């Protein structure tokens, strides 16, 4: 019998009722330079089963309590046992209170403690964040409890299912504002011991999880709205950001998104107010703390004068995501971190629904396909993938919990939930979802509970019929990794499924309970007309006349890619689809025009079609106006650019892409009235952005000339930037590529005085587009200078230079030569040797380059490679793969491009 304090999961003998917590950050260092916070807490808990030990989480807290580390009292007239001793057990992050007798079932106890910790700049628990306002370094105090860091701010039963109410008090400088999950009780009062401090008490939370607590002390200011039901909505930011109006977009969209979700969930927003706060350099991106959601600035703030449309899209979707959680995840909470995929998958899906409500003309819901589906399919089509579900008993340590937060959890979670909603229909999905939220409000669940409530909705109607239970179907998609390729022979209507792997030689060693067979919902369109829905059962092979065609007809599966799978056809059907896209593309839904490209390039990779069939699938693009199919092509061909852009293949490739994109360029030139006005909706703006990028990077003279004119014009009038933020990255880059030290020095000046990160980013990246070796080398020479290049930007900048075909050898030489700055930046901040290595070696595709990477590896003796040790192995592995791919593909690809370029 192991001792319970040496087990990672808490006992279930004691359950918390409510906490009082008082925190007091000291935002002035103690002159050895240490920042601290002090706290006092009382937890009231109920004894379920007798026990002579109290085990509660504590991390990096020193205790100053009088006596033992806690004082223990009975509630009401309960007696309490004497404390034997209190100890801290660091490994399992416990405060352990050994008692001289047993606590008694049904009795409640209160445990009081006093403590302090470092207010570290470490983005964990209660922590400090430093930023600049003019001359002054400002310091604020804020929180990040997710996942297991509430215990770093005060002792608590720090597991998501052990919910409780919290009464938070902040003691803070009297001229700063204090925020928490709930509204303040009233005006702050002076701290009697020192009236330079004030005390702000907050209203009692609902019953909630510790990982969702938040509290913040800052000089921040807000923009406000009161919704019709009296819910107060505020956006908080740096005084200067608020004054510039950068909070207005967030405020604009928040009301509509909250309204959408209350109706979507059939459940009122469960709090009296909604605060969202933009934090400078919040590396975690955003966190859904209940009533007080935190964001990195660039995720919440928006500058209409400098921000592109894609920035706007990022703001509305991240807001929709975090707000989605205020019901799904916060009101009803998954019992344990092994079910994180459901929480994060659900939010990652409905973020598009919420954002769509706020921006109904943008067709946002479509973007889940490129954004999540095909993104996660890249990693889920590997032997090294993993099922959405993990046994709860395998997820114990804080490191194991952190591993839950990955692409599979978010993006495959989103993809499968979206599939589920689609085959249930949204109305039916919403009924079960509402039933689930009502039944489990303020409590905890597993994914099985959601399946059960969805099944209840299915059972209560007669319209939607499923081939099996919701659970049995979703089991196929959650208990085994990966996804099928569905292959159709349209001569017979034979249809098959098999586990899809990009590497046709891969060995899958992870076994599945289902032999990698799925139950697959299959929609289809024949000659542009919707067909009856079909389910492929858990069989290798089936037949249906739905998928049988005449000679002059075509069929296409997985309308709008609602289903988490990819599709192959016989060549005849492929050609018929190709001629349709050639002659009238609007018969096929825009998402499917993209699908044909996405799937066919993946199939070519996996040797299931020839690479020329994938290329053939791009031939229609010369008539394509819309964003997604072009995006499909650009994403699929970026590897071809990477392998071939230094080879004889590249001229014919550029020529073919010039041919394809010219009509699109001409279309927008007219539509935008000579580039003076952007297209109206988001998709068309995105298409314009890509069309200009593609034209300019492939050397279309008309785009090159546009880029030179605008940049000339900006240089003659530096304070009036004539280039729309949408087009800035391309126009900057192409213009600097055409120009010399005049253009380069000017853009450098503008980088030095850029007050906005997004604009600094674009300039930094464009500066790497110069075609002068000496400019790129001098630039590389700056990247280690923290004066001229922020350290957090150094590897990014080197990678951008590596990306330049002329900068490739320069960056590689520079990284090798100054590698002996591992002993200067595995200590002086983090870095990302890993991201540096991948970027600089990304192109390597010959034996000779592999010989160089091996030779570079022989500075193994000392310094080593740090956090990129694993990366350098991945680079030798990827170069081998690239060598093999280029040998296989070079001849067939060269001759296709020659043939199709005119
Ligand atoms: C968790 O925090 C709560 C808020 O501080 C505590 O409840 C408060 O206790 C206060 C002081 O004990 C009470 O305020 C006043 O106290 C004086 C003592 O001199 C009493 O006579 C007054 O009756 C009382 N004043 C008023 C206007 O009620 C509060 O009653 C009380 N606040 C509440 C209940 O909202 C909890 O006790 C504390 N929990 C634990 C376990 O200590
Ligand atoms: C929680 O308690 C810890 C242990 O008491 C504290 O960590 C200790 O900080 C000490 C004081 O800052 C350090 O001791 C010495 O302090 C003198 C004067 O400040 C320094 O000149 C010395 O460098 C330092 N001693 C040595 C050997 O270097 C300790 O380094 C450190 N002790 C341990 C065991 O980690 C925490 O400060 C305290 N935390 C908070 C937030 O209160
Ligand atoms: C938050 O929502 C607000 C209300 O919908 C938006 O306010 C709108 O800002 C528009 C963009 O500046 C304005 O449109 C036009 O602006 C120029 C200025 O000269 C002119 O073309 C037009 O005269 C003007 N619009 C019209 C219809 O004439 C609107 O003035 C304004 N609308 C309202 C109702 O005030 C905010 O833009 C929005 N904030 C963000 C960041 O999106
Ligand atoms: C946090 O504050 C709440 C609200 O004041 C406290 O809830 C009260 O609990 C007391 C003692 O159990 C009851 O007598 C009252 O009926 C409760 N009031 C309300 C409005 O619910 C709660 O006890 C506090 N938590 C702690 C640890 O003291
Ligand atoms: C809140 O009070 C503090 C102290 O009065 C102010 O912070 C000082 O500001 C000056 C410049 O204005 C700095 O040089 C000092 O070093 C600061 N003191 C400390 C201890 O940091 C602060 O400006 C006030 N803030 C507001 C919003 O009124
Ligand atoms: C949850 O949804 C139900 C069903 O839409 C809502 O109750 C219905 O409200 C409509 C609106 O006029 C009535 O016509 C129906 O008769 C109601 N049905 C029932 C069974 O009551 C309810 O308003 C929603 N609740 C929330 C909080 O959004
Ligand atoms: C975790 O959630 C479950 C529900 O999924 C909670 O169990 C419920 O407790 C409430 C209030 O005591 C009862 O009304 C229900 O009968 C329970 N439902 C069950 C047992 O299925 C459970 O209390 C939560 N766990 C913790 C530690 O709070
Ligand atoms: C379509 O599937 C059917 C199997 O249901 C295939 O036809 C069978 O092929 C086997 C293999 O020799 C014959 O022995 C069976 O008698 C056939 N079944 C029949 C005719 O009902 C057919 O080959 C498949 N067509 C494809 C894959 O294009
Ligand atoms: C496939 O996706 C398209 C969107 O790309 C869907 O078209 C939308 O349909 C909804 C509801 O009918 C309309 O409100 C939108 O205005 C449509 N948008 C566009 C751009 O046409 C289409 O309904 C989807 N097809 C299927 C079978 O689900
Ligand atoms: C996987 O096993 C098969 C032989 O059964 C082989 O073709 C292949 O080379 C093996 N390894 C890899 C990494 O593909
Ligand atoms: C092509 O098909 C579209 C959509 O089905 C139809 O509206 C249109 O008539 C066709 N366009 C032409 C030019 O025939
Ligand atoms: N990997 C993390 N722990 N990220 C924390 C961010 C929190 C939030 N749950 C999100 O998905 O944005
Ligand atoms: Zn989330």
Residue numbers in the entry: 63 to 964
Paper quotes:
The most studied member of the mammalian M1 aminopeptidase family is aminopeptidase N (APN), also known as CD13. APN exists as a dimeric 110 kDa cell surface protein with a small N-terminal intracellular domain, a single-pass transmembrane anchor, a small extracellular stalk, and a large ectodomain on the C-terminus. Cleaving after neutral amino acids, as implied by the “N” in its name, APN degrades peptides that are involved in different physiological pathways, including pain sensation and mood disorder by inactivating enkephalin, as well as regulating blood pressure by cleaving angiotensin III1, 5. The seahorse-shaped ectodomain of pAPN contains 4 domains, head, side, body, and tail.
To provide a molecular basis for APN substrate recognition and catalysis, crystal structures were solved of APN bound to natural free amino acids with varied P1 preferences (methionine, leucine, arginine, glycine, isoleucine, and aspartic acid) to probe the influences of the extended binding pocket. Due to the nearly identical architecture of the active sites and P1 specificities of pAPN and hAPN, pAPN was used for analysis because of its propensity to form high quality crystals. All of the free amino acids in the crystal structures bound to pAPN in a similar manner as alanine, with the exception of key differences in their side chain interactions. The amino acid side chains were oriented in a pocket in the pAPN body domain with hydrophobic walls and an open end. The side chains with different lengths were able to fit into the pocket because of the open end and were found to primarily form hydrophobic interactions with the walls of the pocket. Polar side chains were also able to form additional interactions with pAPN as in the case of arginine where the guanidine group formed a cationic-Pi interaction with Phe467. As predicted from the S1 architecture, the P1 specificity of APN favored hydrophobic residues. Amino acids with large positively charged side chains (such as arginine and lysine) are also tolerated as substrates because their side chains can form hydrophobic and polar interactions with aforementioned residues in the S1 pocket.
